[PDB]
Amino acid sequence: PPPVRLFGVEGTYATALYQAAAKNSSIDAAFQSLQKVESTVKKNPKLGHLLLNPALSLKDRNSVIDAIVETHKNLDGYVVNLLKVLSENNRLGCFEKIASDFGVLNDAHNGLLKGTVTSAEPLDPKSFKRIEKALSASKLVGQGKSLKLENVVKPEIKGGLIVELGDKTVDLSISTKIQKLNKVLED
Amino acid sequence: TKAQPTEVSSILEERIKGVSDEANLNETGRVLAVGDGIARVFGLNNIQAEELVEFSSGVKGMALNLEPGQVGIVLFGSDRLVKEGELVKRTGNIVDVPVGPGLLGRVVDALGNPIDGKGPIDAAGRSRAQVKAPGILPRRSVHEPVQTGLKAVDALVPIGRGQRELIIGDRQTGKTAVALDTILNQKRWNNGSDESKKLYCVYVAVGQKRSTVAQLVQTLEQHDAMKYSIIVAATASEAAPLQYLAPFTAASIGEWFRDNGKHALIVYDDLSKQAVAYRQLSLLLRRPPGREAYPGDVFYLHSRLLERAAKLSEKEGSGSLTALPVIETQGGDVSAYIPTNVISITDGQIFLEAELFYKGIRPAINVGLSVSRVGSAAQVKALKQVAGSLKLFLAQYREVAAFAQFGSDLDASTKQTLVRGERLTQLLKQNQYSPLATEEQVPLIYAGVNGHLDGIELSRIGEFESSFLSYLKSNHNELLTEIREKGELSKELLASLKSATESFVAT
Amino acid sequence: STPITGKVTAVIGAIVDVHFEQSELPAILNALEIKTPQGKLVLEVAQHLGENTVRTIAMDGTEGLVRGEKVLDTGGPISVPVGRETLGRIINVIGEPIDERGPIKSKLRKPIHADPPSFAEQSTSAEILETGIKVVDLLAPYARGGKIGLFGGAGVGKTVFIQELINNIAKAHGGFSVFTGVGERTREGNDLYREMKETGVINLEGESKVALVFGQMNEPPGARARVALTGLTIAEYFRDEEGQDVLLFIDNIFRFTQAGSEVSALLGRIPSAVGYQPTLATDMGLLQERITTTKKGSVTSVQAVYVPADDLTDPAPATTFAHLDATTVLSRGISELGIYPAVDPLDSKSRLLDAAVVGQEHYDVASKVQETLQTYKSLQDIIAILGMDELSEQDKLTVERARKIQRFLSQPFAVAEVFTGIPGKLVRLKDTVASFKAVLEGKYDNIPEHAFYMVGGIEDVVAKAEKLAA
Amino acid sequence: TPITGKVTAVIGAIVDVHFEQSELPAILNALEIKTPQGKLVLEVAQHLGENTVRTIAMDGTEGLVRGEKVLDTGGPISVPVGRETLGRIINVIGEPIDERGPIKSKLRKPIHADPPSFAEQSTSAEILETGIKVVDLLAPYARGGKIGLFGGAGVGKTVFIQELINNIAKAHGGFSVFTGVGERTREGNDLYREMKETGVINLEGESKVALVFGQMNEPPGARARVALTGLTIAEYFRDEEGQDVLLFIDNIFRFTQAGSEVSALLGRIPSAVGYQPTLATDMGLLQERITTTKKGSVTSVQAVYVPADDLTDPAPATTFAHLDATTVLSRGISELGIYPAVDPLDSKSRLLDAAVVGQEHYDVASKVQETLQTYKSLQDIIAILGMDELSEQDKLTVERARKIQRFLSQPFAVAEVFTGIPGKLVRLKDTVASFKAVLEGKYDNIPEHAFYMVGGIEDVVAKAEKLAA
């Protein structure tokens, strides 16, 4: 079965897509072509959301598909069959949804495990590196499966950081500790 | 977010893979979900509605939902045979049953297999489960008696051939016994000749345990009446689709009698259990309406079933299936949806009352809640004359009786009524599993109505009835022959009968 | 136009969904025909559900429908035939001759759906219909153009009452009548057919002063619902385009409710009280409003209603109760007492019994009758238990007259020469008023009680006194 | 190659598995998930497709980790049956919970089995005497029959059943199965002790009884398949060992309840009241797996906890259909204090025919019914207007009926303790005679309280002497 079954509707499309291109290989190619047409789809404003939204027929949708394969003639063919499927199921609002999911499955297949280090402020590159090193040398990412890690800045968190990936987190923020401390001296 | 039945991942991945099946979308299709005895198969787009589909397990199932991609095929068997991904190949036939005279002396399951196992059915045809009701033009007005041998039924709510008469009343009030009495009196015609003057009785048993059915066949074999009866059975164990299909295929068997021009009678016991079966079937189908717990369209099911019994014209060979529905009433609630529906469809009600069962009328028919809309035109001409004011007397008795239990100083007129009335109810009293010949119901009603028994003490009325009949059998057996032969009472006969009755007042 | 082809997608009961192609959408309330070995299955378009997929209700049986079966669109509501040829010919729900006389149609067809007549169109009646049935004439006077309503129990000779009305009133009047039967039994159908052939109202060598639309309940629920609309349009054709007065008859409108309840549930609409359709009111309303006396014509409906388990507090009778002008209650008890008409006089109410409308004399006489009977009913309890003798001389005279009046109500019916044998009597309105007045004064208290029983007018009552005397 | 799977969902005790292998166990197959608490037995009930079955879980869920290994046991749970079942109390899985150690299995049979054929059926008619006065007079039981109670208070139901076991099963010599579906653990312990005491279970000795006991605390799903297990044990005796058996089932309302509980979770939109939209079929199979075939006669006793005492509820209603005789027990008669609490106007038996128990028996019963019905009829009038101010004829009837009502009493032997009155068991032949006399008003001349809570006519005479002092 696919690397990581995310489940969920619209991810049934992704699952299907994944296994279909997995058994014929060339998943990276499929993903790349899908990304490329997806990116120029977002960067085309009519059919950027103003024709991604339902209000079209099967037939009118089909002619939208025909225009889509004009946009980048030769994608990977499996994703051209996917476009047909999407036309027939008359979903296209969950087009980017499938794209994101196929990416997750794809980069899971690659083993590129992207994570995140939400923090209050942009952190030092030494901090980035040390955390990445530690994380690679941890049980959590033993390595063998590639590590990507992204620090993001979220203002809501007040001080500290939380490292997250694999549904395994170490939450060592300041805000939470303050909360608990306040609470315990309100008792 | 939409979830379509075509978003099944094996289907979906095949479509993405380009190449996809056809022909397994015509005459074949692959099961994909199946549980609750209700399959959903993908394919079969050449399926016609109501068709029978052969599961590769060997299960046969009719198809009741043709959905926008998945045909919902109701299994006739247990799903412990069926399993996911099986192929089903369309039989290509809507259900059909063998119909013939060979069904006489056969207990048969819905698909027409002898479950009494008296070997192969001698089937003179096959028929289809649904057959639309004969039109107005095929019909001709009723003119044929049916004498159940129960005095109250014949006198008060007469039944004729073609009529729809609903037997309604509380659960297991020996519901079967009321019906069985009719069958037993059809021995009298059975012994006789002219086969269109014989009712070939079809007892349909839905939802009942094998032991109950087995007892019935023993009783019938005891009365040697299985020699002219067909028992179509669908026991409780037998599948809900098979139970649903059982009345409509019983009807088809009946129509074969009609087609031959012969007359027959079909007991549908219980239609209520058909309705429960259809409730479970509908809900298992995802069939949307609760209907007060019975799905909308149950009235359509019952209505189409019942209107397939009719008295036909002589250019239709003068056929006539007569029907007797049996409806259990949950606490006597006639405003319950299934009871309401049936009452409208039928042309009579034969309400049975529990209190009166205990009071000693056994069977007990609450004559207030019993009607026969068609009425006399099947009541013997003689019996019509005698029982003319029997209805009035009883009606007066009912009003008077209400007053009477407050037992105040009685108006002379009321205590005349009270005394007469008390005797009349006791006169009516029936004895289970013992029909009575109409020729010998005419004397008893004459005696009672002409007040000869009003005097005779209440306790010994039961003795009197037996003895009176014996006395007439001994002495006025010529008179009885005439009542049998001529079936309307002449002035001379009325007087003769009066003289005989008068003599028997003092014994 | 060109064929508008739809492909069935789901056959699941009466609901059959069709997949018309783009730019060839039908419209709500159109009629689709599907060619079948059963002739033409008619589907009434009832929803658009999206992407050129309609949800339609079947009018013929849905057995053996093969998935993706081509569906033609007629393009508009079911189009009946209308004409003066409709008179004396029997046509089924889709307007097809079941009398097997072949083609019926004048020059016109009309849609089954039609808009209710406007406020402007309305014209108020005041004419007094004569039924000849004395109890009805005095104590619940009917009016020509009215919306008469036969509330009563389960088919309690219900058909017989209606049959008598058709037998008397139809021949008597010069107008047309329309008998519409909503899912009435095929036994009843054969009887009606035979009966009106016998009474010659239906004369197959001549014209008929009535048309028939006999609906049978073997027909699916959808057909049961819209049989009423079909009949209604024929009446509209008479009222409007033939300009004449009519005397519509519908039977039984509880079946109209039941049918509608069923297809509401089939349509998936959340059922209201006692399972009855959420659209019950407006559907009843549409039928009822359509029938009215305009300045184009006048149509006098008699709509039978079946009061399930004799409980009219049940919403379906109660909803109809509002819409009908001149209610009539038929009671099992009164029938059982042996009085045919089974109409219970004190329970029947007609708002046409307004004093001016029927004239002061009629009103006063009828008030006196009503009081006399009501007193008698009150006194029934005293006589029964307490005793007859303790009643006053005044009370005793009122009781004796009431028993006579009670059985003076009893009059035979011509169509119950079959259900009895005694030939019926059509009694003039004036004669009835006169005869009841006489009785109250006790001018015929020298006549036996049983010489009022089951006879017509005063002349008959006097004659029957002589017969009993002999 | 055992079918491996993962636990996709754990929505209540209706776990869903996703088999990774393309092999798919069929409906009613059984799966074992090896629990760190033991094992959990699950039974495949739907195939929802995408290799995701939906399985009923027969043991108490908790600690389930989604993804846990599944193993396919295949087919319905196959219990072990034999003569070795006799003298064991066995759990749903068939393992002795009375710690008699593992049964020496002979034949192990799947819990689900198809119900015997129409041909197989044979109709018995032999009277089975009870010795309870009301039972004997009003609704005589038959041997091989399906007997029914429709009690509302289980406190009374258990006593009634206990009395039946006490009388009938000592007289009976053949094998007997007690299957107690969802009943009180304390009560079950009482039975186990009592049975062991009355030697029917003799553990050191031999037992001609076997026991299956299902506690009401056991998870609903477990309770659902307790019944099927018992029917299998019974079937083994009936068929395979051929012996004439007995069977007691109490409380079979719990079978119904359990189904109603699972139904929602299974994914079925519930039918009226709340009962599962599969109620008729499920009940049907169960009551047709209990039969008197031509290979054996199994007298079965079914006890129904009518909820709220509403018989009109569909679940009691569908129980009424499959029973040869019923003896509805109701709160009113309990309030009247009469033990047995059998309604005398709500009992029936197929054997009440005069062709069976004789015309004289039937006539005696007829008079009792009519008299009591009159008495019930005049209850309104009695309250509104004095009983003195009723008709002379009626007052005799009323006096007779008050006596009849009291006469119907009879102290139980098992509950001789609970009643506090030494038990009374009276012959059927004696009963008919006694009532006949009373109806002829022979003993109508002595206190009404002398008929109250005591047995036979001779005892009434003696109690008159006691009262007279």
C389 CB-near residues (< 8 Å, 6+ apart): none
Contact indicator for D139, D348 with CB cutoff of 8 Å: yes
> Cα angle vertex C221, ends B256, C111, to 5°?
120
B358 and D288 in contact by Cβ < 8 A?
no
**What are the structural domains, with CATH classification, of chain B?**
21-93 (2.40.30.20), 94-379 (3.40.50.300), 380-507 (1.20.150.20)
DSSP state of C17: E
Alpha helix positions (H), C141-226: 158-165, 171-172, 186-198, 221-225
Dist. CA B455–CA D132, nearest whole Å:
42
Q: Look at residue D396 and give its three-state secondary structure.
A: helix
The pair phi, psi for residue C113, each rounded to 5°, is -90, 140
Cβ neighbours for B298, distance < 8 A, ≥ 6 positions apart: B275, B278, B279, B291, B337, B338, B341
CB contact under 8 A, C22 and A90: no
Contact B130/D at CB under 8 A: no
Q: What is the DSSP string of C203-244?
A: -SSS--S-EEEE--TTS-HHHHHTHHHHHHHHHHHHHTTS--
Q: Taking a C-beta distance cutoff of 8 angstroms, is the pair B206, B247 a contact?
A: yes
Query: Tokens at residue C415, please?
Result: 């169509």
C90 interface with B at CB cutoff 8 Å: yes
Question: CB distance from A63 to chain C under 8 Å?
Answer: no
Smallest CA-to-CA distance from C248 within C305, C193, C180, C181 is with C180
User: Is-contact D326 D273, C-beta < 8 A?
Assistant: no
CB contact under 8 A, D345 and B79: no
Name chain B contacts of A1, Cβ cutoff 8 Å.
none
Residue D420 CB contacts under 8 Å (≥ 6 apart), including other chains: none
Question: What residue type is assigned to position B194 of the chain?
Answer: D
* Chain A residues touching residue C51 (CB < 8 angstroms): 57-58, 90
List, as one string, the DSSP characters of B159-205.
EETT-B-EEEEETTSSHHHHHHHHHHHHHHHHHSS-TTSSEEEEEEE
Cα distances from C134 to residues C139, C249, C327, C336, C345, in angstroms, run 8, 20, 16, 19, 11
Given phi > 0 = left and psi -120 to 50 = alpha, else beta, which region is A141? Answer: beta
**Catalytic annotation, pick one of C7, C185, C296, C396:** C185
**B126: part of which helix (H) or strand (E)?**
strand B125-128
d(CA D252, CA A54): 55
* Distance of alpha carbon D443 from alpha carbon C406, whole angstroms: 54
How far does Cα A40 stand from its chain's mean position?
Answer: 18
Q: What share of chain A is helix, strand, coil (3-state, %, to 5)?
A: 50, 15, 40
Which of A9, A20, A89 minimises the CB distance to B17? A20
B abuts D (3+ Cβ pairs < 8 Å): yes
Burial class (CB in 10 A: 0-12, 13-18, 19+), B87: middle
Q: In units of Å, what resolution does this entry have? A: 4.5
Q: How far is D395 from chain B (nearest CA, A)?
A: 12
Helix (H) or strand (E) holding C461: helix C458-469
Quote the CA–CA distance of B231 and B227 in Å, as a whole number: 11
Candidates B44, B131, B140, B299: best to mutate against C (most CBs of C within 10 A) is B299
Is C157 annotated to bind a ligand? Reply is yes
Please list every residue in chain B whose beta carbon sits closer than 8 Å to the beta carbon of residue C218. 132-133, 303-304, 307-308
**Cβ-based neighbour number of residue D320 at 10 Å:** 17
State the catalytic residue, choosing from D68, D183, D187, D218. Answer: D183
Cα separation, C217 vs C184, whole angstroms: 6
C-beta of residue B277 within 8 angstroms of C-beta of residue B246: no
d(CA B286, CA C372): 60
Contact D264/D220 with Cβ under 8 angstroms? no
Q: Are there at least 3 beta-carbon pairs closer than 8 Å between C and A?
A: yes
Whether B3 contacts chain D with CB within 8 A: no
Say whether residue B287 is in contact with chain C using an 8 A CB cutoff. Answer: yes
Across the interface, do D390 and B208 touch by the CB < 8 Å criterion? no
Domains (ranges, CATH) in chain D? Answer: 1-76 (2.40.10.170), 77-351 (3.40.50.300), 352-469 (1.10.1140.10)
Q: Which residues of B touch A19 (CB under 8 A)?
A: 13
Rounded CA-CA distance D153/D330 in Å is 8
Tell me whether residue C184 is one of the annotated catalytic residues.
yes
DSSP state of B103: G
Q: Does residue C64 sit at the B interface (CB-CB below 8 Å)?
A: yes
What's the gap in Å between the CA of C221 and the closest CA on chain B? 7
H-run or E-run covering D81: strand D78-81
Fold annotation for A11-110 = Peroxidase; domain 1 (1.10.520)
What sign has the CA pseudo-torsion A71, A76, A79, A80?
positive
Pick out the residues of the known binding site of D for ATP.
151-158
Secondary structure (3-state) at C436: helix
Cβ atoms < 10 Å from Cβ of A47: 16
Chain D closest-CA separation from residue B2 CA (Å): 18
The closest of C344, C359, C298 to C325, measured between CA atoms, is C298
- Nearest CB to A19 within list B7, B13, B15: B13
Q: Catalytic residue, from C110, C134, C144, C158: name it.
A: C158
The CA distance from B461 to the nearest CA of chain C, in Å, is: 27
Backbone angle region of D221, left / alpha / beta, with phi > 0 → left and psi within -120 to 50 → alpha: alpha
Residue B147 CA to residue B435 CA, distance in Å, equals: 10
Closest alpha carbon to C210 in C166, C245, C254, C168: C166
Residue pairs spanning A and B at CB distance below 8 A: 44
Local structure of C266: helix, strand or coil: helix
Show residues of chain B in contact with D268, CB under 8 Å: 36, 283-284
Nearest-CA neighbor of C365 among C205, C141, C159?
A: C141
Q: Strand, helix or coil at D250? A: strand
How far apart CA B123 and CA B103 sit, in angstroms, is 8
CA-nearest of C64, C56, C58, C63 to C94 is C58
* Residues in chain C closer than 8 A to A57 (CB atoms): 22, 51-52
Of B235, B290, B360, the CB nearest to D370: B360
With the C-alpha atoms ordered B368, B371, B375, B376, is the resulting torsion angle positive or negative? negative
Half-sphere exposure of B74 (CA within 13 A, CB side): 26
Dist CA D83 CA D86 (whole Å): 6
Q: What are phi and psi of C335, to 5 degrees?
A: -65, -45
- Min Cα–Cα distance to chain A from C119, Å: 41
Q: How far apart are CA C148 and CA C71, in angstroms?
A: 42
Alpha helices in chain A (DSSP H): 11-22, 27-42, 59-71, 78-88, 96-110, 125-136, 175-184
Residues ≥6 apart with Cβ < 8 Å to B228:
B104, B186, B190, B198, B200, B201
Beta-bridged to residue B43, according to DSSP, are B29
In sequence order, the β-bridge partners of residue C350 are none
In whole angstroms, give the CA distance from residue B150 to residue B157: 10
Spatial distance between the Cα atoms of B252 and B86, rounded to a whole number of angstroms? 32
Does C425 reach chain B within 8 Å, measured CB to CB? no
**Chains A–C, number of C-beta pairs less than 8 Å apart:** 8
Q: Supply the DSSP symbol for B54.
A: E
Q: How far apart are CA B118 and CA B279, in angstroms?
A: 34
Neighbours of D465 (CB within 10 A): 10
Residue to mutate among C8, C9, C11, C263, with most B CBs inside 10 A, is C11
Q: Tell me the shortest Cα–Cα distance from D353 to chain B, in angstroms.
A: 9
The CA distance from D93 to D108, in Å, is 12
> Do residues B30 and B41 make contact, with C-beta atoms less than 8 angstroms apart?
yes
CB-count burial class (<10 Å; 0-12, 13-18, 19+) for B460: exposed
Q: Compute the Cα dihedral for B440, B444, B450, B456 and give only its sign.
A: positive
Chains touching D by CB (3 or more pairs below 8 Å): B
Residue B131 near chain C (CB below 8 Å): no
Query: Does B270 sit behind a cis peptide bond, omega within 30 degrees of 0 on the bond before it?
Result: yes
Q: Which residues pair with B74 in a beta bridge?
A: B38, B62
Catalytic residue status for D62: no
Chain A residues at the B interface, defined by Cβ less than 8 Å, are 9-10, 12-13, 15-17, 19-20, 23-24, 77-78, 81-82, 84-85, 88-89, 91, 94
Residue C268: which of B288, B308, B341 has the nearest Cβ? B288
Residue at D184: amino acid letter? R
Mutation target to probe the B interface, by most B beta carbons within 10 A, among A5, A7, A12 is A12
Q: Exposure string (b/e) for A5-30, b if CB count within 10 Å is 16 or more? A: eeeeebbbbbbbbbbbbbeeeebeeb
Q: How many CB atoms lie within 10 A of CB B292?
A: 17
Q: Which residues of D are annotated as a binding site?
A: 151-158
- Residues of B comprising the binding site for ATP? 169-176
Going by C-alpha positions, the residue among C140, C135, C150 that lies closest to residue C353 is: C140
Smallest CA–CA distance from B79 into chain D, residue: D27
